[PDB]
Design an enzyme around this catalytic site. Sequence first.
Site, PDB file in Angstrom:
ATOM      1  N   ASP A  16      -3.659 -31.218  98.662  1.00  0.00           N
ATOM      2  CA  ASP A  16      -4.160 -32.099  97.608  1.00  0.00           C
ATOM      3  C   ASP A  16      -3.293 -33.332  97.316  1.00  0.00           C
ATOM      4  OD1 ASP A  16      -3.370 -29.946  94.693  1.00  0.00           O
ATOM      5  OD2 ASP A  16      -2.174 -30.430  96.433  1.00  0.00           O
ATOM      6  N   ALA A  88       3.516 -16.087  88.688  1.00  0.00           N
ATOM      7  CA  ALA A  88       3.174 -15.279  89.835  1.00  0.00           C
ATOM      8  C   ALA A  88       2.574 -16.083  90.969  1.00  0.00           C
ATOM      9  CB  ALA A  88       2.211 -14.205  89.422  1.00  0.00           C
ATOM     10  N   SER A  91      -1.478 -19.592  88.917  1.00  0.00           N
ATOM     11  CA  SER A  91      -1.498 -20.711  87.951  1.00  0.00           C
ATOM     12  C   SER A  91      -1.752 -20.359  86.480  1.00  0.00           C
ATOM     13  CB  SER A  91      -2.455 -21.824  88.419  1.00  0.00           C
ATOM     14  OG  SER A  91      -2.074 -23.073  87.837  1.00  0.00           O
ATOM     15  N   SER A  92      -0.862 -19.557  85.897  1.00  0.00           N
ATOM     16  CA  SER A  92      -0.886 -19.319  84.449  1.00  0.00           C
ATOM     17  C   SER A  92      -0.692 -20.647  83.693  1.00  0.00           C
ATOM     18  CB  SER A  92       0.168 -18.276  84.034  1.00  0.00           C
ATOM     19  OG  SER A  92       1.493 -18.796  84.026  1.00  0.00           O
ATOM     20  N   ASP A 137      -5.293 -26.538  90.865  1.00  0.00           N
ATOM     21  CA  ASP A 137      -5.194 -25.488  89.814  1.00  0.00           C
ATOM     22  C   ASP A 137      -6.145 -25.721  88.636  1.00  0.00           C
ATOM     23  OD1 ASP A 137      -3.054 -25.001  91.533  1.00  0.00           O
ATOM     24  OD2 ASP A 137      -1.459 -25.138  90.107  1.00  0.00           O
TER      25      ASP A 137
END
Length: 337
Positions: A16, A88, A91-92, A137
């Site tokens: 991207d 993790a 994408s929190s 994301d």
Amino acid sequence: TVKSPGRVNLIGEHTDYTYGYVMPMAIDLYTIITDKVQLYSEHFNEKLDLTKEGSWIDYVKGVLWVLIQEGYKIGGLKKITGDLPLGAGLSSSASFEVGILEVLNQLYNLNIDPLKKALLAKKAENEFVGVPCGILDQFAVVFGKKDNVIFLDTQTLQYEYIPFPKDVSVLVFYTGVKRELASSEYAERKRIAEESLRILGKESSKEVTEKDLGKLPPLHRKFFSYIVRENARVLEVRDALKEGDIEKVGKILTTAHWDLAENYRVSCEELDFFVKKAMELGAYGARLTGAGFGGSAIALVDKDKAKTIGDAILREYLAKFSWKAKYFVVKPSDGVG
Ligand SMILES: Nc1ncnc2c1ncn2[C@@H]1O[C@H](COP(=O)(O)OP(=O)(O)O)[C@@H](O)[C@H]1O
Ligand SMILES: OC[C@H]1O[C@H](O)[C@H](O)[C@@H](O)[C@H]1O
Ligand SMILES: [Mg+2]
């Protein structure tokens, strides 16, 4: 109350920031948000007249800053729960950003259209919080649809929904690893790609030729040659998926992983262990997802077989490494609602 999903990228990694193709999915593991700005972060057990502090609230402060700079009339808000693991590779970050944004969208009735929701959440993360990252994301988390992945041309924001077979599950495996170098490694990859386009006179990695790559210097050519190869794979995953040939899809992810691991050099021992073990246990394919250097990986796996495979790889992995790995059998989901 607002449910914001996390996300996983099927194919199209490190693509991207040169405006290439990408195929994320929102997944069914969520962030859930319940006069001044005062929020309780249940994970952390913790906190308009807008300074960065060095803490998580900075994601909250970047969204309100970005709405205000854009002229929207909002105010304050008064809890954050969730399935989704922080840090993790699911994408929190984006889940939390656009979950906050949509709370304001709903309350103060901004009627902000979806694609701006994403471009707004990404400016908050780029300019306010100091973190570089393309549109992957935020787009996935906003545009997710139930039994679909989203082909995206990130140059033109032209997307297409492609049904993902319901009898196939994406096995998400979190390695438990977050290497400290990951951040500066991302920025190097990104610096080098930007430079390559510039040297070549080009505006996107979609345009790049075999003779173009010959004009790049050694490392630039090694790194950019991968991106040109992913772009092509995305297009091939695209046809395969639309025919329901999940075995072709799977073979391609697998190629992608080893191109990432050998050439772009963003895998690591424990992502490779997961992929190797997924393939000994019958997966269609498997491959790291997101930036690399740790974080999470995916395997394509029959739905009826997913929990047995996951449990097998987990125990196998936990015998080898001391990290706190988890796995999730995940369904392609709707974006923020
Ligand atoms: N539910 C949440 N509550 C509080 N902070 C959160 C929450 N979800 C995400 N965050 C913030 O966003 C960050 C996510 O970090 P990030 O570097 O983007 O890794 P990831 O790729 O999983 O998002 C966390 O460190 C935390 O500061
Ligand atoms: O494709 C790898 C991926 O790396 C990180 O997840 C960034 O947030 C994305 O924009 C993308 O570059
Ligand atoms: Mg993140």
